[PDB]
Design a protein around this nucleic acid. Structure first.
Length: 89
DNA sequence: TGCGACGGTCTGACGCTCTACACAGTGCCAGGGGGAGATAAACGAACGCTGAACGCTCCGG
């Protein structure tokens, strides 16, 4: 489990994230999911900040860092030739 | 070896803009090494103060 999650931290994401930041973001994700299934609603970032004992600015920074890139080759729709990479200057 | 046929492999499948969008279910902490920022001191520099000192026009008894 240790080696698999270490390689998941160091290799799964294209923009590499250090292992401590990976465990921080997935702990935040799992406690957010727990609060969502308990309260039945999306938890406010302030309550997440108090329950994680971190500052709200740290919480929103963590949510910002927890993203996934989108490929430049995703088609828009019916047309195959018009790409997502040709709409950005 | 000749035979069809069986099968995989491979290719494109008129043109443009007006329009045009985004992407989702399973761990956790302690010990240790580096460099970012604050600290108070340091060797050297030039920055000021000291008016003194040279020289001028100067109103002058």
């Amino acid at each position: 489990r240790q080696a698999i999650t270490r390689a998941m931290a160091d290799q799964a994401r294209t923009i590499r994230i250090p292992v401590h930041m990976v465990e921080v973001i997935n702990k935040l994700a799992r406690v957010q999911r727990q609060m969502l299934q308990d309260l039945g609603r999306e938890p406010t970032p302030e309550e997440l900040a108090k329950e994680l004992d971190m500052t709200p600015e740290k919480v929103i920074e963590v949510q910002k860092y927890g993203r996934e890139p989108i490929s430049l080759h995703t088609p828009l729709g019916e047309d195959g030739d018009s790409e997502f990479g040709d709409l950005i200057e």
